[PDB]
Amino acid sequence: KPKVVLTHWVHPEIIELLSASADVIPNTTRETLPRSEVIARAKDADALMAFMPDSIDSAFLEECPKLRVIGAALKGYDNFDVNACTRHGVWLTIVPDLLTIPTAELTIGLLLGLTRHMLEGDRQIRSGHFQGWRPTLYGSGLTGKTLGIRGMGAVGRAIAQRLAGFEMNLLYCDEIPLNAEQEKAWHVQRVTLDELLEKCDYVVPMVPMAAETLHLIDATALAKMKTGSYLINACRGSVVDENAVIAALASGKLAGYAADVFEMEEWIRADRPQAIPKALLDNTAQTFFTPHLGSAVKEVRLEIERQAAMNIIQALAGEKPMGAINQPY
């Protein structure tokens, strides 16, 4: 039977699904193996299930000459050398984009946790000093306040659909406008970016991959927005300028920053740090963060895993995998 190496943890029903026809080497832990260990297990693997920390280049593929398919549990492939996979006879497949809705829900969670001081409220309960209502942790409400979504892709649309019930004044800017039926269903008004920043209490950058500009919010955009406003970032790491956020945090220009993504995360940008700034990390008062949980819901992660596994089973049986992005040999 063929051998499939899985670089990260999958749910056990996926293991049993692959084990009908392949010999499965699981990563039993929640950790990322080092490159030296991955190549060691896949030295003689017929298939490899790859995830976001994986990095497939010609050096990797030369050390794995038995490989016939790489099944990516990812919706894109920026970290693979696709043409090298082809040159070496390796199918390279992806899965559809299933992240849109769980990321809009977590963006909103981020919004509420930050503006309602829910972390420091949890900390005070986890002490012992709680003895009832107190005039503290007076936060900031959504109702009647104005919120702006910089981008209006599928995920920005997913937020607006969900914020619709919150009696807010939702502004959006985007080069292409929503259908007028969507604008009336979600009471969301289209404006410029000068307007959006000037007038918003909450700014959420949320642009589809197609409309890409790095550092979309910098100190230049921070100065333009309302004083004491809040910024929430779960789009991508490059979209926010972290050092300029820290500046507005200090000058009272920002009362809060929340983020599920960071610029350090990425390695295709040359100006990459590789730790999260200590300035945002010590400020537990004005910040709320989570470790790229944007898609960390079980139903979604399971469906992403099944589809890469199906991709893998299909290629091994000598079929064209439904998810191919290349045609090898």
Ligand X SMILES: NC(=O)c1ccc[n+]([C@H]2O[C@@H](COP(=O)(O)OP(=O)(O)OC[C@@H]3O[C@H](n4ccc(N)nc4=O)[C@H](O)[C@@H]3O)[C@@H](O)[C@H]2O)c1
Examine residue 99 and tell whether it contacts ligand X (CB under 6 A): yes
Q: Which does 109 bind (CB under 5 to 8 A by kind): ligand X, its own copies, none?
A: none
* 265 is annotated as an active-site residue: yes
Which residues precede chain breaks (C–N over 2.5 Å) in the chain?
Answer: none
Give me the amino acid identity at 41: R
Site for ligand X in 292-311 (CB under 6 A): 292, 294-295
- Site mask for ligand X (CB under 6 A), range 134-173, x = bound: -----------------xxxxxx-----------------
Angle between helices 154-163 and 100-115 (to 10 degrees): 50
Selected range binding ligand X among 17-25, 26-34, 202-210, 308-316, rule: CB under 6 A? 202-210
* 181 is annotated as an active-site residue: no
In the complex, the smallest distance separating the C-beta of residue 176 from ligand X, rounded to whole angstroms, is: 5
Give the residue with the Cβ less far from ligand X, 68 or 236: 236
Residue environment code for 35-60, b if the CB has 16+ CB neighbours within 10 A, otherwise e = eeebbebbeebbbbbbbbebebeeeb
Q: Which does 72 bind (CB under 5 to 8 A by kind): ligand X, its own copies, none?
A: none
- Bridge partners (DSSP) of residue 5 are 25, 48
- Bridge partners (DSSP) of residue 71 are 49, 93
Structure tokens at 15: 């293991």
Residue from 294, 190, 185, 182 nearest 232 by CA:
294
* 292 is annotated as an active-site residue: yes
Which of 105, 265, 266, 306 is labelled catalytic?
Answer: 265
Residues of the shown chain interacting with ligand X in the complex, contacts defined by CB under 6 A: 76, 99-100, 103, 151-156, 174-176, 206-208, 210, 213, 234-236, 260-261, 292, 294-295
Q: Which residues are catalytic?
A: 236, 265, 292
